[PDB]
A paper describes a structure:
To allow stable substrate trapping, we used a ClpB-K476C-DWB variant and incubated it with an excess of casein in the presence of ATPγS. The biggest displacement is observed for pore loop AAA2F, which moves upward by 34 Å, placing it at the top of the AAA2 pore loop track in state KC-3. In KC-3, the ADP nucleotide density in AAA2B and the displacement of neighboring AAA2A arginine finger by 7 Å from the nucleotide suggest that ATP hydrolysis at AAA2B coincides with conversion from KC-2 to KC-3 and AAA2B inactivation. Activation of the seam subunit AAA2F in state KC-3 is linked to resetting of its pore loop from the bottom to top position, indicating that sequential ATP hydrolysis around the ring dictates substrate threading in sequential, discrete steps on the substrate.
ClpB is composed of tandem AAA domains (AAA1, AAA2), an N-terminal domain (NTD), and a coiled-coil regulatory M-domain, which forms a repressive belt surrounding the AAA1 ring (Carroni et al., 2014, Heuck et al., 2016, Oguchi et al., 2012). ClpB activation requires two signals: (1) interaction with the Hsp70 partner chaperone and (2) binding to substrate protein (Lee et al., 2013, Oguchi et al., 2012, Rosenzweig et al., 2013, Seyffer et al., 2012).
Numbering used by the authors:
A (entry chain F): 737 to 858
B (entry chain A): 159 to 287, 293 to 408, 527 to 543, 553 to 858
C (entry chain B): 159 to 408, 527 to 858
D (entry chain C): 614 to 858
E (entry chain F): 247 to 287, 293 to 368
The structure:
Amino acid sequence: MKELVLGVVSHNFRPEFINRIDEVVVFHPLGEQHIASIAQIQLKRLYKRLEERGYEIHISDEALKLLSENGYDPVYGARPLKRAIQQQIENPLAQQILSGELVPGKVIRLEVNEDRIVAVQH
Amino acid sequence: QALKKYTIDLTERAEQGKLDPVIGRDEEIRRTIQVLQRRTKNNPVLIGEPGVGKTAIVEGLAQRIINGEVPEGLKGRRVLALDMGALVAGAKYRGEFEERLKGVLNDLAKQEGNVILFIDALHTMVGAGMDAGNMLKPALARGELHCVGATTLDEYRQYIEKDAALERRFQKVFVAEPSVEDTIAILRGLKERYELHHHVQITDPAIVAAATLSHRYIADRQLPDKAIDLIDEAASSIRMQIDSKLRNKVTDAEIAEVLARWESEREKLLRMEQELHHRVIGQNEAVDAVSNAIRRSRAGLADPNRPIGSFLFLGPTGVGKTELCKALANFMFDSDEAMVRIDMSEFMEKHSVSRLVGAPPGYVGYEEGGYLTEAVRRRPYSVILLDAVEKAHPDVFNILLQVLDDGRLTDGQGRTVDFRNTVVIMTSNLGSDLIQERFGELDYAHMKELVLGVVSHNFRPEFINRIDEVVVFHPLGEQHIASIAQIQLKRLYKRLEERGYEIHISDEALKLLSENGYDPVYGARPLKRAIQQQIENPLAQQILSGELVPGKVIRLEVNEDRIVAVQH
Amino acid sequence: QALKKYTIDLTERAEQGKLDPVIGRDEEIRRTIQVLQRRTKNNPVLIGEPGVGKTAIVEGLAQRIINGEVPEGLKGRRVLALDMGALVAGAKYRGEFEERLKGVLNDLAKQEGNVILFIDALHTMVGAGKADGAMDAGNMLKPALARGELHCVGATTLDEYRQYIEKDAALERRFQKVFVAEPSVEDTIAILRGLKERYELHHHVQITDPAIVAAATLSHRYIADRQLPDKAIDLIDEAASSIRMQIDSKLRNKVTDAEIAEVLARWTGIPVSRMMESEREKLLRMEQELHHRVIGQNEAVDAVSNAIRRSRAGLADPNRPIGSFLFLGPTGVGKTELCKALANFMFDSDEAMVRIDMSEFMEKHSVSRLVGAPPGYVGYEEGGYLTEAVRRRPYSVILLDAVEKAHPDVFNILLQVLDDGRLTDGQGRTVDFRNTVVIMTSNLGSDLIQERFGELDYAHMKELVLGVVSHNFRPEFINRIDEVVVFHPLGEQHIASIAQIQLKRLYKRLEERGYEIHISDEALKLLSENGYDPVYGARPLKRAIQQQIENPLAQQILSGELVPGKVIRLEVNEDRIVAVQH
Amino acid sequence: LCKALANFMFDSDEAMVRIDMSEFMEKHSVSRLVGAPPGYVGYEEGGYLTEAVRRRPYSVILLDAVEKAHPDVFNILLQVLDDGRLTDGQGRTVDFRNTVVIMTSNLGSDLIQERFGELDYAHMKELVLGVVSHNFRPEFINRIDEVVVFHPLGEQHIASIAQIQLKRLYKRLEERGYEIHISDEALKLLSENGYDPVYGARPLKRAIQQQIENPLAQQILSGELVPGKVIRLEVNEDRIVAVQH
Amino acid sequence: AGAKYRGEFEERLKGVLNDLAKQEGNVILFIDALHTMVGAGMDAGNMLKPALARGELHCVGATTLDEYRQYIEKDAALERRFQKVFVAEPSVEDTIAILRGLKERYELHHHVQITDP
Ligand SMILES: Nc1ncnc2c1ncn2[C@@H]1O[C@H](COP(=O)(O)OP(=O)(O)OP(O)(O)=S)[C@@H](O)[C@H]1O
Ligand SMILES: Nc1ncnc2c1ncn2[C@@H]1O[C@H](COP(=O)(O)OP(=O)(O)OP(O)(O)=S)[C@@H](O)[C@H]1O
Ligand SMILES: Nc1ncnc2c1ncn2[C@@H]1O[C@H](COP(=O)(O)OP(=O)(O)O)[C@@H](O)[C@H]1O
């Protein structure tokens, strides 16, 4: 693969220009568990943003599997997962918070529907 | 006077005789007399590269005036010279160029036209912010101006041939660079002045040696400027050698010292087989063929409209084919950097030709230019490298026939790209297994003839007609490629000794390194990358942990299947 | 006063008579007077292309004022050549230029309608006082212009008019356009007959009046740089200085038309020079000199000899080029050799010419490579290669080789070329091809020529190959050809003579190397046996000479075998050719 | 005919706007007739055409070899023949309502050499106008006022052309100084040596060129002829030579 | 600093140049920033240019290659009195030797000591 893409860049560029590269390196699509780990990272920064808002959030691992099965295809990149997170978490959450409903202090548990994600206040 | 502000009298010092006894360039002085003795348009201009003695032309005209060697209309004149570099650099705001300019014009109107002015850099007069074409162009047509212009043809047609009204007054006088023998004649006219200055003598064989070597090796400044510079600085060096704490005659040895610092040509051409085996092992017959072709090109019997040598290369790639081209460029002209690697694998169409030679105007790759010819224009003494020439479109071979016939090639942009100073290397691998499988005990010549017949059935016969010699590039054995791996280990140890580490090796480790990436099908660079990736990566892993110390003996001892580094 | 500081009285100079006699220009001076006697916008501007005599119109008007040959309203006036450099120069302070210009304008109002103002370089008056927040001269003159109370006279080039005045319409309508055309030949001869007295008083020499009419005639025909009368005046002046230095340095005392031709040939090198007996015996030995390099192929030598003689003999078709040719023959019969022979005859060099091989142009759009690219596109500011290569040195030879390779519609360009010698590059200026020779080569009926050059006349062979050419080209294009010639395969005697020529240039280059070398005629016979075929001609002789001479001889020179001064006979081996050292 | 128009109208042969479409073989060169649009390379130079009609409006536009161009260049001339206003790259209009627009082509000259006989002028104009309708669009050809048809030149016209070219030859040679006569039979040799009804008048001219000027330039450059002599173009059995009397 | 007239600073410059002509080659001068003498504000560079082109100047210049290339080489008489005498950057070891030349200077000023490692 490195040899063939090196031939491709040789079709693109000067030949001895790309000899001066430190190394022709390859980035690639990624596997299943990497998606779940980086989704946990994005959930962590979401927790940080809403803790700076003043809100504290618990998640279901079922909801993590819902995210990992909804915002998934290696064929494009990461940001389908990012806007899947964005939509399916924040949009009901922005519906609930600007409603003036969520009192701080109560745990924002990311419960699930059959497909969607619900935040409750018990 | 305002003449005591920006003008220089040369009839002053020439009446004193205190200028250069200018010898040569008589015809340019004659045409200056032709323009200056007209009734109108009496402002000649001198055209040439800077440093051709145009100031000396004006001063020699002044000396002919003082000597009375001029006709009776040039007499009583005063040679003047105006600055074009202070009328603008002093000019802060509106009208300080023009104020000084009109002051000069009126104070020369007091002089009543008995004054000849010099002006260099006529291009500077056009653009200074309007400025002076609109104020000298009347005096250019009034005839009361007696200017002497001096610039170069390229700035002349870039700036000055725009406005034809400025063009119609000045009269072009081409002052080219003088020859080596004209330089000899001028310096023999000026050896007396040097030897009366430093109270020494001058070797005239060292003069002609300085002229020849200054013409050959250095092209920064030109004749006669560089010869004056080298003679005066070498005379200064000899003067310091005399007055340090012994010869008065400056020798050509000091000329060569100031030449290289501030001769190995002919026998290096004669010993070119040893030169090719200075860095490349194996391919002895190919070395002999290349060296004989180089010497025959330097023999001076072939066509002066044809290049150094026409070549086609065959055999297994990567074994040192490119390395041969690198060492050939090194001991041919300079170094390992005058070469252009070109894959003919890409070019298979008509717009392939439009890429490689040059686009027609109005199209996609035009001032991006041709892939070959622009790189030739940048490096006029190089070696042209081609790769997989069998993968070319057939009309590219018409361009190749133009190369091997005329030694020149009009690009898409429309100019001349000379080829009589490079080496056409074209590499292929059509008769690969004919040489690889029959490497054993078959000669160089009949294998060459056999694969020559094969490629004759492959390529065009008129194409390979122009080829001087096709070397074989027989597959090197394990000992030659092992020795090349040893040389790579030597330069590796050289760079690590630049880093500063005493490093040894096991011979079994050397055998395993030689047997990492040995392959007759691909080339030597698999062995290179194999040894590279095996050694280099765990090395720095051991280093930056804080294990290795500069000065410790590092034997590359073997593991069972690996190589371990020790610190002893 | 302020008029003394910044204006120059031309009428006082013509009162001293220190200005040039101006003859002609009657409708131009009359319309200038008609504009100068008006009520609003009195101001004529001499739009004329650079160097047709525009300053001299106003100078002749000043002389007609001094002589009193004007209407009564202009008798006693003063023409003041206004200076712009006198006004810009002293003012880096704010308002100091406007101070000067307003003081000048108040003086011109004070002069009660008696001063005619002349402003040379009106385009210098446009960008005059352009300091940061400053009026130019336009914003200050512009009141007094269109109240009629200033009698300005402009004098500008037409290209300066477009950029510097038509960009500013306000000052552009304040004047009155006076087109001042370049004069025709006969009136320019009349003007030069007027100006003979000045140059006779200057250089103390005389001028042939046939040399004057020849200078005007050849200047209008051949020089395309400058414009009349400027180029002819410069011819006469430079000839006068040349005659003055021929007398004064080390013969004659006048300026003949041969001196005009020598000036023109020194300036470019179009061979207008009269047939001196060296040149004329050279030209009568045309075919003899062409067979000093090209053996055989007599008929094209005859045709091109005829064409160049008709060119040099003053029988040139003054619109078509010198010779519009077409070469036809099989591969390797020295067509390019004949073209290099013409270049060597004409210019003492083979590659003092332009060869453009049309095998490079197998696509259509390389038309734009040789004629240029339009405004807007990429290579606009460079020109076409062919047009520029002519535009430097118009007297040259334009060679097109391998004409069957290109697309058929490249040859509308050469329709223009062989109709008038005119070609219009991408910037849009004409390039005169009236001093060019166009040679086109192909290998169309090479099978037919190799088949039927025997047992056939030259004429019906030319007929049949012309039929083949009409199968190839357009009927428009082949009408433009002066003559189509037919080549033929050579006999072995021609190739032996070519081998003799190669031995001559070889011995020349080896005397340059410094070796006295001879050859056995048996070796010449072996070389004639080697590089011979009727199908390909002498390119097999080229490669045979190449290999069997350049490899062993240069190999033995570098072997230290060949000592200079030794007689070196190139004798034969059993199958090869051996050098000896005797 | 167009240069004769220039000679009548301006007392001058080569004073006309000759923009030959034989360079304009692409849709590109519309730019080089109406200048580059703003921001591009030769913007401040304008069109070649609209500048040189803004200088002198009363002139002749000449478009020789008009069919060679890419067929959608003529839309410029849709404007020129509808109103005679053209808009170059600098936005301004150059008013062509005094210009004399002339176009010359040979779109059916095989058919015109084939059938100018045995058909009248009207049906020939009809059929060649059908051919031009196959080569142009109805937009363009509806603008042209008169589309004439030209026929080739028979022997009388060839004799007249030979006389005019020998007039300009003698007119050149008068400044060379050699008043030369001719045999009246030599005119018949030129007619019989210049006659081919498929190429018109130029083979006549180059036959005149060869069969007169090559002995003439041969004998003048021979060091043989002195000015003022009565010189005649007497014939040989096949040649025509110059004699000195 | 001691001049405030257009014709007193220039008077000083003229008098010093006449004294340089008077000393008859014994004085070998140095002036750094020759481009600054070109543009100081008749500017002083063009005032000393007669002392260039009269065979009297024994001065030395000092600048960057940019000002020598632009403000000097592009001038004519200012070119043909000089060379491209290039000041090199020294070595690290030469720098350490020069530091040893002036270690004691800084130590005696600041009352401290400097270690050679
Ligand atoms: N025929 C000659 N006799 C004596 N000295 C000569 C002759 N030709 C050139 N020189 C010297 O060659 C040197 C060339 O310097 P310049 O006159 O400055 O060259 P240039 O042609 O004027 O170009 P630039 O732009 O001024 S460097 C001077 O020192 C001249 O004195
Ligand atoms: N009718 C004429 N009679 C006499 N001399 C003439 C005549 N027309 C032009 N000349 C001369 O032609 C030369 C050039 O004409 P000028 O007017 O000086 O040039 P110009 O008109 O200023 O052109 P530009 O704009 O400066 S490029 C002068 O020497 C005039 O004397
Ligand atoms: N009559 C001749 N005189 C001199 N050289 C000739 C002649 N005929 C052929 N040659 C040689 O043969 C080659 C033919 O050149 P060229 O005219 O380019 O061939 P082509 O006929 O294919 O155009 C030349 O390079 C020349 O060396």
